[PDB]
Symmetry: D2
Subunit: 290 residues, 4 copies
């Protein structure tokens, strides 16, 4: 497996100097840095090429996460939003192609976080979504990009909350490059079984996010990491595992993730770095070759 | 310890004929029925007495749960909202005393569920709430009621998310009738240690809600029940334990709890009855 | 799934008035009573029909457990011990048939408990055992009995300590009536994964013993019961599940099981019955479907 | 917190060239090397100073483990055996003082492994042992050595099988240089609660052995490491943590520990080294 970490562990907005983080995680021993998609549509060609060259020169692979805006909601009942959305993704996937990125994940079938003050139509949203994802998927394939649909807890989305729902949705889409994506923090809430959910995902699992129950770095909390490693070995998971810790208050990240206390316990950057590296060593040790 | 269940397990709105449920759970074997406070202020003085009568007749003890509305938000920066909130609690609490209820719990220090659309001010809300709660505490003490502050996960509230934050708030309130309340569903998300959180609550723990990670009845999910039982013995817990399963879609309950799939797996009322009864045997066995 | 309990939970010797426990256990709600095989060769056909009819009357299914003596050692290098051993099971299995018992289990490929002051030849004992068991297995087929080979921890046996070893031994024996048997107390010591060991057992699993890490009744300890239910479901286990708690010091049972403190904490018979009943409610709830 | 490993992980007999292992574990990053006491009584005085020189040279602290032989049984009903036992330990402890080691642990109140084809007189053995250990304690105190009594599973000892029995024994001995010692492999069998056993030992815990359920190195097994680390933090443990993995068949070690299958799966020295270092990183990280 290839191990990565989301840059947002160090930042409070959905954008940053990704080159700085590529240099950092390469020194910490990671294989991957996952970056937020938000700023990419504003990258000039030379900026995309420099980012790509940076990743390549440092032996780092870039993956992309995206929490879509309501205006990029592929499941919208408004035909215009669905059109703006497909247009947004099309342009984004081409940028990913130029970046040599082959994976994007997150609530790509909806938007995030969900504004629950608006009325919900799961059934209706579900079918518009399946349709929209079907065609975005075709652009993704032409770009060499796997489009991973992340199963989320109920407080963050209502369409896909369990691995079974994720598999159902992905089978309906029925496209080779559209995958299910799990996240230990979300599984921790919705699943009857962690290993079971992973085996349920099976051949459809295309990406995995890690973090403790309250989103600390993997290892020192209650997530059943050994059971997870066993299940990944049962399904022959080949993919990437990207830890996504959020331990700092503040900014759009703190607000969207809902960090209302200093979970980092006053850590400075170097401290954060050390904990992520210990967490990487732990992940490689516990999660592999079971 | 005394075991109960929240009536909402069977209903989709924050009210119901509580008499029908006092008889149901008395039969199923529960010692307690927990009821939503919402419809109570619309109970006449006579309706109160028959509810109480109905409870005493069935050997069932009544506890109350309450997810406050924005207008009952004791943490509010708006003095008129705070004023109305103290009035609601004082009226609600006098009714509780006449109903012969000695415990109310929920996000009593705030409102539920939070609309994260508005602007949050944790620091200021926290100070206002501590003060408003201490006042309300005098009334709760009078009506012989335990004002229980429930620690909730980050998605449903931002003031108190861990047992440690709960104990800090309660110690700040510094009042006899205010307790910390824990819920296995919420602890499962926010805590480093389930047993550790319970031990942190210690003597301040006044009420406990149970449910699996995804809110099914206690037993066949991933919650560490043995560890909870051992930690309650460590602190010598002598309160009640109320299961709060939510396995049904629809209504204000389904929307507030966020049940977007049929977790009950098509259960009918009898099937719901059986599972709750089995979870009750399980809880008395494992937890004590 | 059918749920039972070992009568020994109440007794300190490997024999007892099984009719008394058949009645007790029917009132507590079990579907099965497991009895020790050692007193059965001393039973007349009258006692065998007596026991069978009584089980039948209280609706209880009977299963058998046996910790073989050194003289009943099917793996012994001494060919006379092996001949006497085969004679012993040949007789026993015919009695089981008369009792309409379709399952016996324990360290049937060896003897129990092992005396480590002796000489070990795991490789040698293993080969002799596979040979003897396959033979006994024909007699088992004939008597309609499932010969279950229990995987034990290292302190009690050295031949088969993990589900994988148990599976290798059974595959090698290669006979329909031989199955692997697992016990949560033994898996707790030896296995890397509990769900994994069950799954490795797979279709070869023919019997399951349960108890907490320190042998108390199932449920209030550290054994991962939910994980066990899942794995039993993953392999579609239909067999029975028998709790085998040991919480009392004294006697052969106490010395053989090595109970050196009062784990029951003063439990009198009624208290023991209460906990077994609660543990049985727990097992049906957590372990099934 | 100091972390070590028992040298027997790489050897099949209760002795070896400890200098070779001091260099190896310093290179892998350990703080401590734990050695078997067995060969030490017979160390010339030169060999004692060389061993100590090496340890200091490599920045390694040495701790000692010991499975006493039947003739060294301080609990024996036989007075000549108790006499020898006491002479054995006073000589061993004085050497330890020379070797500059401050900790010895194991079934020091008895002998190991127990021969169960003999008569078990628990109450009598227990009384004699408490009295004997108390005497030895005085010498241990003079040599600046913590005499740690290890709690073992039922198959390896019958006097002390739980943390509660270990604490009861140590409190009866009533001497500051005598401590309780826990081992995750042994707790995994006997305890109701791992965290609970650690909290029961509390201030009395003077040493801790680690290993997976089946004695593989810590990390990929079922032992609840986070719970252990949280309980060590609960009591404020000021001792060391020594992993005692046993993954190889053969010799006195393989038969005393009862390894009947190749648990190491063909590992050569280099592979045993890497797995030890990975478990060390895991332990420092998870146990805090
Ligand atoms: O689990 C999550 C969100 O809770 C991740 O998918 C990521 O943070 C999100 O997609 C926004 O970047
Ligand atoms: O756990 C919670 C909310 O998740 C409850 O205690 C809440 O106050 C109650 O559900 C309101 O009806
Ligand atoms: O678990 C075991 C032994 O520890 C049993 O299966 C044994 O065969 C039985 O207890 C003998 O009576
Ligand atoms: O855990 C134990 C024995 O199972 C050890 O501490 C023992 O004292 C040592 O292994 C002997 O060398
Ligand atoms: Mn995620
Ligand atoms: Mn931490
Ligand atoms: Mn922690
Ligand atoms: Mn609750
Ligand atoms: Mn057994
Ligand atoms: Mn008990
Ligand atoms: Mn040890
Ligand atoms: Mn217990």
């Amino acid at each position: 497996m290839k191990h990565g970490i989301y840059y947002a562990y160090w930042e409070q907005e959905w954008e940053a100097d990704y080159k700085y983080y590529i240099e950092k995680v390469a020194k910490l021993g990671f294989d991957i840095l996952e970056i937020a998609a938000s700023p990419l549509p504003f990258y000039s060609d030379i900026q995309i090429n420099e980012l790509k060259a940076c990743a390549h020169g440092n032996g780092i692979t870039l993956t992309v996460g995206h929490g879509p805006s309501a205006e990029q909601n592929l499941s919208s009942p408004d035909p215009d939003i669905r059109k703006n959305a497909k247009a947004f993704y099309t342009d984004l996937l081409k940028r990913l192609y130029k970046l040599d990125v082959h994976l994007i994940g997150g609530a790509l079938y909806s938007y995030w976080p969900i504004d629950y003050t608006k009325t919900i139509d799961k059934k209706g949203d579900w079918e518009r979504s399946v349709e929209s994802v079907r065609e975005v998927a075709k652009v993704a394939e032409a770009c060499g990009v796997d489009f991973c649909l992340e199963v989320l807890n109920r407080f963050e989305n209502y369409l896909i909350n369990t691995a079974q729902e994720g598999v159902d949705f992905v089978k309906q889409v029925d496209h080779n490059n559209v995958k299910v994506m799990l996240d230990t923090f979300h599984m921790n809430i919705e699943e009857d079984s962690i290993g079971g959910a992973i085996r349920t995902a099976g051949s459809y699992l295309g990406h995995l996010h890690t973090g403790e129950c309250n989103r600390k770095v993997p290892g020192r909390g209650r997530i059943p990491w050994v059971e997870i490693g066993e299940a990944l070995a049962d399904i022959g998971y080949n993919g990437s595992v990207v830890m996504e810790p959020f331990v700092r208050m503040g900014g759009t990240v703190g607000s969207n993730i809902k960090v209302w206390r200093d979970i980092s316990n006053g850590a400075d950057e170097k401290m954060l770095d050390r904990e992520a590296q210990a967490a990487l060593d732990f992940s490689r040790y516990v999660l592999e070759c079971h």
